[PDB]
Design a protein around this nucleic acid. Structure first.
Lengths: 110, 63, 25
RNA sequence: GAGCCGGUAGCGGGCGUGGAUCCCUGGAUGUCCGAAUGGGGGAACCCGGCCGGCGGGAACGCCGGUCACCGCGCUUUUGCGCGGGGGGAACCUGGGGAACUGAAACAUCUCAGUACCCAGAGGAGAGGAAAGAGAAAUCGACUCCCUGAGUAGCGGCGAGCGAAAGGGGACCAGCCUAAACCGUCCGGCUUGUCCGGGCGGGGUCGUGGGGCCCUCGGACACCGAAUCCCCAGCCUAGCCGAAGCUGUUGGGAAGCAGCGCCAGAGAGGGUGAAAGCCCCGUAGGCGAAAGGUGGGGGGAUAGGUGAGGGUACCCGAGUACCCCGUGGUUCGUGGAGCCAUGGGGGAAUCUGGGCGGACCACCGCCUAAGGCUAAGUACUCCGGGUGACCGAUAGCGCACCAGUACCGUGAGGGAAAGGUGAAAAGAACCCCGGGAGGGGAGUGAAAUAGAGCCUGAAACCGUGGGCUUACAAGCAGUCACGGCCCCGCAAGGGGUUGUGGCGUGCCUAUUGAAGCAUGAGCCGGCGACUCACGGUCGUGGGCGAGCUUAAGCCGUUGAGGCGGAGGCGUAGGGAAACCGAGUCCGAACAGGGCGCAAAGUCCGCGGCCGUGGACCCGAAACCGG
RNA sequence: GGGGGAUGACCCCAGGCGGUAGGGGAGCGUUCCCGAUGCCGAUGAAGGCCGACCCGCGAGGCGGCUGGAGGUAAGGGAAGU
RNA sequence: GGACCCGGUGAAAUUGAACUGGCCGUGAAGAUGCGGCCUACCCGUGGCAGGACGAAAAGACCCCGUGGAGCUUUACUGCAG
């Protein structure tokens, strides 16, 4: 990991969880400030960019896989019709309501 | 890297600081030449100009 | 400390410092 | 650390924090080929002994396991138990080993001991404690880098080939056995005293070993391994990990503006258009294991050698030495040695025996004719780092269903072809139509971004328009004058031409060229005076005695700085002895070279000259497998 | 070449100037390395497409249309020009 | 039976470029393109061979490179036997 391309080499080829490494971030005031150690993943938040910028929503699906996730809110409808969840650019991602009602959620991040 | 007809460098050859070079007369003698005497008095040293450039050069360096 | 530089800094800054150029002895 | 059943996105179904996917390491399976090895064979198939369940044997009997090739030691007995062999890009030594081409032919020579083939060692082999080198009574392992030196020198003295000791540097490092002398024996002959092989003595480093007699003397000396954990390094994932938000032009902001923080980590990359502070498992910096491989380093293992004189003496080899015929060496037959050997003679055991280049005297060196020996140099398949290194005809030829498609019987050849987008949201539905494909709607910032769908130029084929065209010559055309047509650089120009006016295209090689001499059909991209070491003048400049190898150290950036063997100038003149601002010819003051300082030297950048495939492609041919 | 050049430049006249191998001097764009107290650009990097300002020139600048992301160096260096 | 007229398909070497006439003269000496002249409307299809020094192929005949390759003998040397 000392060159441009060795980034694709220990992130997605190595431990997929390394991609978890990607789900990385912070969120609201509470929690955050409070720290930032111990995540949740499929939590809630509210992006901060892209037309949808400054929006309200929640963490639907830990997609690490595709390299990002989905946010019920954030989405769109096809052209045939039916609606649908859009792709979640890892990038602009916000979480404040730190999913933690599940004791195991509060025993790791908040 | 370089050398030189080391030869000629051997036989006939060798310069003066002057930037010039000379080799022993070289009329006839030392082969056929019952010929004469005074002619003998015909072997000191002969300095040819112009060409003495290939020469010198080609030798260049040590001599 | 590299914040004692922020110091002996404010001592004498400018643009030439811009340049700068460390070096002890 | 919380998602997954690989690239498959799709249907149908499912495992999971009373630690799944996957990252590690050690496992057990490893069907058939391939050294193949049980036997045969046109590989990937077909055949055999021993054990084996016993197995459907419904009231009737099979696969599985197995096993075994052959050359190697030798507990020999009837031979039981260990090693090998096959690979492998490049690199290593041995075994064998060539023409081209240069010499402007070519027989000597060169390319070379190169290219190739063969065998085989290794992770490195090569080599390696000296019958060595040379001569200052000086040096000492081998190796490798610089230097010595393009010197001494080899030669149809032609083209060329072209050492070494010594000095500087990296490393260091030393040991064994036959080596019958002693004793031990075991086996023979046949009892003695012979040869024999296992045990020690010694088991030689720079001359000693034994055997005898008296002095001995009575603990720190580990190697190539052997050993223990040690920091075992790495082995992939180890993990923390400083600090901004609002406002805004925007389809998108991380931009434009306002205020805010970081900091040994402003290395870059991903983020809808350019962030230190949004993601980054990055540089800051500390982190990390039960298995696979070291030095460093600690210890005993330590294996192991380690002092005195004397005596008539016996103990590192079968061929040294010599004659002929080759080798290597700088040595091409030479005044020609050393070492290595193809044939034939066939010595010595310390006043022995080679050596210091024919030989000889004397001096000086060394002690062969067995063996092991890490480290210092070479090489990239592998993994990383870095780029005045490339960008899809460049780079490996091959950026991803390529050494594959495809021609070749074969050995072998050997291509082309990457790019939508922010993500599919990849175009439901309606239309002409057998469809493909075209018309709308919808995504959308834009689809003349639309599915081989970024940029998407030229050549070349179209569709309309201006001008122009039927008594006319030249690619060309360009100068004059005229009419139609447009004047976003208006009283000046655009475009097109009717006439007339003067006109032989374009490249190489050519005495000479339009050409009827050749070169080219058209467009786009590749495509040809380069680099290195020398030398050579010119110039930009640092000291005039000028200047640096190789290496040692220092190194986000990584910062150069020390290193004084050398080499060119400091006189030269001469074959030399040698003399020397003088010298060689000579016996003569007659000339040749030089003196007269004018002094360079290193470097940089250039016009050139030699070695180079070396301005670029071009053939018939020779030589290897 | 010569008469004074302040750095330009200006004046005289002498004085030519056709030129292949080929010799000397001076300039131009091409992809890169500087960022010698250098950074432009979503109201376009660049290439493209078209032109009656700047230069003897090889090129420049600059304005209109295109196209999706770069890269420019006022100056010296380098080269697969 | 092609060739010709129809419908369907649809190559190929060579070629700088071209709207390419005869004359008699010319030039490097056998010219549609240069001079003078005479005939001379614009295009085509079925043909006929003469000229475009037509196409094929960097002459095999030639000489030149102190090129190459094969056979020959009282060529030179050397090896096999």
């Amino acid at each position: 990991s000392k060159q441009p391309d060795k980034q694709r080499k220990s992130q997605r080829r190595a431990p997929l969880h390394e991609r978890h490494k990607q789900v990385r971030a912070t969120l609201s005031a509470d929690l955050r400030e409070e720290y930032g150690v111990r995540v949740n993943a499929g939590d809630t938040v509210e992006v901060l960019r892209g037309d949808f910028a400054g929006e309200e929503g929640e963490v639907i699906n830990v997609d690490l896989d595709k390299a990002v996730i989905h946010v019920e809110d954030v989405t769109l409808e096809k052209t045939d019709g039916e609606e649908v969840p859009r792709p979640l650019d890892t990038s602009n991602v916000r979480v404040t309501d730190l999913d933690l009602e599940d004791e195991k959620r509060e025993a790791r991040l908040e | 890297p370089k050398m030189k007809t080391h030869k000629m460098a051997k036989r006939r050859i060798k310069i003066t600081g002057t930037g010039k070079v000379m080799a022993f007369k070289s009329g006839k003698r030392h082969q056929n030449t019952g010929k004469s005497g005074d002619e003998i008095r015909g072997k000191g040293k002969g300095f040819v100009l112009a060409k003495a450039e290939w020469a010198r050069m080609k030798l260049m360096l040590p001599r | 400390k590299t914040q004692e530089v922020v110091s002996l800094l404010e001592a004498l800054d400018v643009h030439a410092d811009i340049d700068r150029l460390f070096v002890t002895s």
